[PDB]
Design a protein around this ligand. Structure first.
Ligand SMILES: Cc1ncc(COP(=O)(O)O)c(N)n1
Ligand SMILES: Cc1ncc(COP(=O)(O)O)c(N)n1
Lengths: 526, 523
C-alpha cells in the first residue's frame, strides 16, 4: 500500500533524454514489436536518425501506463502458448513470507520439447529468434556496400543478421536466448559471440529500492539483470522484480536453498535445492548460475592461493563438500537438474566458483580444472537440450587474458562466455569499474559474449543508484569498444555520427548521441 | 597576499597511510631519492611496501613549505659541480614571483651539458644515479628473479643500475628531462624499459594553478604540462616551476602567439626564438613542438571526419596556409636544437596530426607526420638534444598495436608519449575510461608516458576533483601495463593488497590503495 505507492512514484520513466522509443514490426510473426531508441540530429546536418539498441522496456514509452502493482504487459505470452507445447500448471508451488498480486503458470506438456535449443535443432524459427534477428540489426538496410574494418579473431559475424542465422547459431550451441516460458513480460535478446556484446547488472542485498534499481539499470542499458538477494523472503521480493522486468532475469539458486536450511551450508541437500529450482522456474527466472564445477578434488588446489575462494556460491559448495567429504551434489545430480530446467526452458550459466580473486591467482590449476569440467557439463546439458553459457574470471593481468579466451573456446565448444571484468590490477579500490573496464573491453574483443559489470563500490560497500549507473555506462562503453574493434557492422555508424557532430560544433547532437546525454550537457561550459 | 591564499589552499603533509622515506646516493653521496612507504599490521609479519612517489617536499614533514621562496633548489649544486655551465650575464626579464635568490645558467661555449651528451661521452651523472635508485623501489639487488609477463621484446632488467640508465639514454631509448635552470627538480626517467610514467595538464589565477600542481603530483602525476593561453602566462609559470619538484613541459607556440596578439598568421621565427630562450632560462624541462605539420600534409586532413584537433597543430596549419610556406619549425629546426642544447631542454615532438576520431586513426596524414618526426629525431640527436615522440589520439583497439609498431620502427625506438588513446567516441563525460583502456594497452605494448584524460575531456575545464580522477585513472592504467609487462617491481604491490583483503586487514587494504581516503569513505 504505502510502500507499493512509494515505488510507483520513485522509479524513473519516460523517454531517454534526446531520443524516443521506436518499433520495428515482425514479418514471420507480424504481431511482434521490436524496440529501439532513435536520435534525430539537426536538420541542417542532413543526416538520418541514429538507431540505438534499447533494453529500457515500456518504461521509456509514454504511450504505455506503468503500474508495478500489476506488472508489465505479457506481450510474449500468446506467442509461447501459440506453439501449443505448454500447458497450465494445475497447482503451482506457493511460497510463504510484501506480497505481489492473474498470471497463468506454465510447464511443457509431457513428451513435448520446449527449449529454443530444441526448436533450432529441429529446424524451427521461433518468434524469439525473429525478434532477436530484428533487434540485432538496428534497422540497418542492405542498400550500401558493407566494408569491414576490424579484427574478430576468427568469429563469424555476418554483414546482416537473419532469423535463419540466429537459428543456426543456437542449434550449434554458439548462441543462446534466455527465455523462461513463464516470463511473459520479457523482450527477447540473444547472447553469443557473433552478436553485439551484452552486459549484466547485479541487484539485491525495501522492495521499492530493488524495483527502482532494476528500472534504473535497464534504462541506462543493462541487457540482463541478476537478483543476488540473500536472506529473508527473497522469493517474494523477486516476484516484484521479474513481473516488472522486460530484460532476462538470472539468479543463483543455492542462495535461496541455503535460506531454507537457515544458512547452514552443511545442511544443504538435493531436496531443498530441487524445490528451489521448481519455484524459480514457475516464477519465470531465465537462467540459473550453477556451480556444479566446484568438485571435491579441486578444492585443495585453492589452499595455496593468495585470496582463496571468492565466489559466494562456490564457497558454499566448498563448505558442503569438505563437511561431508563427498563429491559436489550439484555435479552428482547434474542430469536431474537438466530434466527440470528443460521443462521451462531455463538456461545454464555454469558458475565460476573457482575464479581468481587476485591477479596472482589467475589462470591457475584450480581455475582451469573447473573450466574444463564446465566443458564436459556443457555437453551433458546439450544432450537434454538445455541452453548453456559459461562463466569466467575474475582478476587477470592483461597478458593472461587471451589465454582465458583460448582455453574457454577449446574446452567448452564455443559456448558463450560470461565474464566478471576481469580486473587487470588489484591496487585501485574505489575505481574497480575502471580496472575491470580495461579487462572487459579486451576480453570482449577476444570473443566474450557477455560482461557482468562492476561498480566503484566493489570490495567496499553496497552500490547506490548512482554507482549502478556508473557501472552500467562504463560497461556499455566497454561492450561497444569491443564491438568496434571486432569490426561489427553496426558499430562505426554511431562513433562516426557523434564525431561529425563534434567536428561541426553541433553540441546538442553530441550530447544526445552520447551514452549519458544529461551528464555531458551539464559538464559542458557554453 | 597571493602568497597568503595559495599557502592556505594547497594540500600538504603525509599521504594518508604512508610516510616519506629516502635512499642516499653512493656515486653522489649527497643525493636523497624519495619514496613513500606503507607499513602493514604487525600481525601480518610483512615488510613495509615501498611506493614510487612524485609528490615532492609537500608530503615531507621534515620540510617547511614556503611558496614565496619556492621549493629547496637541491639540484643546483650538482649541476654547478659539473663545471659545464655559467651564469647568464643579462637574463631575460618578463602577480610577479620574487626570484632574487636564483642564478640563471647557460652552457659554457664548447662544453657538454645534456644528459644525452654526457651518456654518449660515457659519463654517469647525478641525475642518472638518482633515476636508477628511484626506479628500483628499494628492492634487494642480489636476488634470483623470475618474470611473469609479456613485454613484446623490451629490455627490462631484473635490477636497474646507473649504468643501464646511461646506456638507455645514449642509444636514445630513454630521456631525463632536466633543464639546468630547474634546480628544484627531483629527477625522473622516461622510457619503455622503465616504469610507465603519466602526465597531468594544468593551466587555463595563481592559487588556482599552484593548487592543481601540488594536487596532481600528490596523487601520482610524474610530469605536468602548463597549457595556459592568454595574458601573463609567463609570470604565472614562474609560480608553477619554482614550486614544482616534477618536470614541467610547455607548448612554446602558445606563448609566441600571445606576443602577436592571437594572430596565428602574425607568427614568425623572431618571436618564437625569443620565447624559447625565455622558457629555457625559466627552467622549462621540455618543449612540445609541432615541426611535423608540413605544408603538403595539410590537404591530407580535409578528407578526415574531424580534421585537425591539435591546438598547436591547428596554429601551425593556419600559418602555413596563410604564407604558403613550409612550417618554419621544420625549416629552422637546427637553430631550435642549438638553443635547447644550451640548457638541456628535451624535445617532445608534437602530434599535430593526431586522429580526433576513431574513423581517422592510422591515416595518411598521421603516419606522414610520424615518419617526419623520426627524421627530425636523428637531427635532434646529432645536436645532442634528448627526444621523445607524441602519438594518438582516438584509436580503435585493433589498431593500437600497429601504432606502436610504426613508431618503434620509424622513430628508432625513441620514447613514445600518447594521449589515451580513446578507444571509442560515444561516451563524452566518461573519456577517462574510454582512454584508460587504450592507455593501458599501448603502455603494455611499449609506450613510455601517458598523458591523462579527465571526465571533462571535450566538454569543459577540470576542477580539483576532475584532475584527481584523471590522475588515479592513469596511475591504474600505467601500473596495469607494468604488471602485464612483467616489470620486476609490480606484482609486489598487487599481492600485498590482495593478502590484506584475504586476511580482512581493512586498514591495510585502504592504505595500500591508490586512493586511501576514497576507499575508506566507501566503506
Ligand atoms: C559471472 C558471475 N556469476 C555470478 C556472480 C555472483 O555469484 P557468486 O559470487 O556466488 O559466484 C558474479 N558476480 N559474476
Ligand atoms: C601529449 C600532449 N601534447 C600536447 C597536448 C596539448 O597540445 P596540443 O592540443 O596543441 O597538441 C596534449 N593534450 N597532449
Amino acid at each position: 500500500q504505502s510502500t507499493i505507492k512509494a515505488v510507483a512514484e520513485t522509479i524513473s520513466t519516460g523517454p531517454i533524454p534526446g531520443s524516443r522509443k521506436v518499433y520495428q514490426a515482425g514479418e514471420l510473426f507480424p504481431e511482434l514489436r521490436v524496440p529501439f531508441r532513435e536520435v534525430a540530429v539537426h536538420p541542417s546536418a542532413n543526416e538520418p536518425p541514429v538507431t540505438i539498441y534499447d533494453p529500457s522496456g515500456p518504461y521509456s514509452d509514454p504511450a504505455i501506463q506503468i503500474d508495478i502493482e500489476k506488472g508489465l504487459p505479457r506481450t510474449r505470452e500468446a506467442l509461447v502458448v501459440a506453439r501449443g507445447d505448454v500447458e497450465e500448471v494445475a497447482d503451482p508451488r506457493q511460497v510463504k513470507p510484501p506480497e505481489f498480486p492473474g498470471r497463468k503458470i506454465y510447464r511443457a506438456k509431457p513428451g513435448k520439447l520446449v527449449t529454443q535449443l530444441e526448436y533450432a535443432r529441429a529446424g524451427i524459427i521461433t518468434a524469439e529468434m525473429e525478434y532477436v534477428a530484428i533487434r540485432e540489426n538496428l534497422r540497418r538496410e542492405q542498400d550500401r556496400p558493407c566494408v569491414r574494418d576490424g579484427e574478430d579473431f576468427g568469429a563469424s559475424i555476418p554483414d546482416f543478421v537473419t532469423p535463419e542465422f540466429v537459428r543456426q547459431e543456437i542449434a550449434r550451441g554458439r548462441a543462446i536466448i534466455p527465455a523462461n516460458i513463464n516470463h511473459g513480460e520479457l523482450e527477447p535478446m540473444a547472447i553469443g559471440r557473433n552478436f553485439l556484446v551484452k552486459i549484466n547488472a547485479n541487484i539485491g542485498n525495501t522492495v521499492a529500492d530493488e524495483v527502482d534499481k532494476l528500472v534504473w539499470a535497464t534504462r541506462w542499458g543493462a541487457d540482463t539483470v541478476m537478483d543476488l538477494s540473500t536472506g529473508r523472503n527473497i522469493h517474494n521480493i523477486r516476484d516484484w522484480i521479474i513481473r516488472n522486468s522486460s530484460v532476462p532475469i538470472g539468479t543463483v539458486p543455492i542462495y535461496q536453498a541455503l535460506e531454507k536450511v537457515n544458512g547452514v551450508a552443511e545442511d544443504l541437500n538435493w531436496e531443498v535445492f530441487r524445490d528451489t529450482l521448481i519455484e524459480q522456474c514457475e516464477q519465470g527466472v531465465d537462467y540459473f548460475t550453477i556451480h556444479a564445477g566446484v568438485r571435491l578434488p579441486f578444492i585443495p588446489m585453492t589452499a595455496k592461493r593468495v585470496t582463496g575462494i571468492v565466489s559466494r556460491g562456490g564457497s558454499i559448495m566448498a563448505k558442503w563438500c569438505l563437511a561431508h567429504h563427498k563429491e559436489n551434489f550439484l555435479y552428482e545430480r547434474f542430469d536431474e537438474i537438466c530434466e527440470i530446467m528443460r521443462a521451462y526452458d531455463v538456461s545454464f550459466s555454469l558458475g565460476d566458483g573457482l575464479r581468481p580473486g587476485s591477479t596472482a591467482d589467475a589462470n591457475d590449476e584450480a581455475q582451469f580444472s573447473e573450466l574444463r569440467t564446465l566443458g564436459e557439463l556443457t555437453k551433458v546439458a546439450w544432450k537434454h537440450g538445455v541452453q548453456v553459457m559459461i562463466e569466467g574470471p575474475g582478476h587477470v593481468a592483461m597478458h593472461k587474458i587471451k589465454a582465458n579466451m583460448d582455453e574457454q573456446l577449446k574446452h567448452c565448444h564455443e559456448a558463450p562466455f560470461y565474464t566478471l571484468g576481469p580486473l587487470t590490477t588489484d591496487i585501485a579500490p574505489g575505481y574497480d569499474h575502471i580496472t575491470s573496464a580495461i579487462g572487459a573491453a579486451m576480453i570482449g574483443w577476444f570473443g566474450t559474449a557477455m560482461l557482468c559489470y562492476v561498480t566503484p563500490k566493489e570490495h567496499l560497500g553496497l552500490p547506490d543508484r548512482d554507482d549502478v549507473k556508473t557501472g552500467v555506462i562504463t560497461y556499455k562503453l566497454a561492450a561497444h569498444a569491443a564491438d568496434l574493434a571486432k569490426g561489427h557492422p553496426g558499430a562505426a555508424m554511431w562513433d562516426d555520427a557523434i564525431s561529425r557532430a563534434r567536428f561541426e560544433f553541433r553540441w546538442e547532437d553530441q550530447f544526445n548521441l552520447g551514452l549519458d546525454p544529461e551528464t555531458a550537457r551539464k559538464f559542458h561550459d557554453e
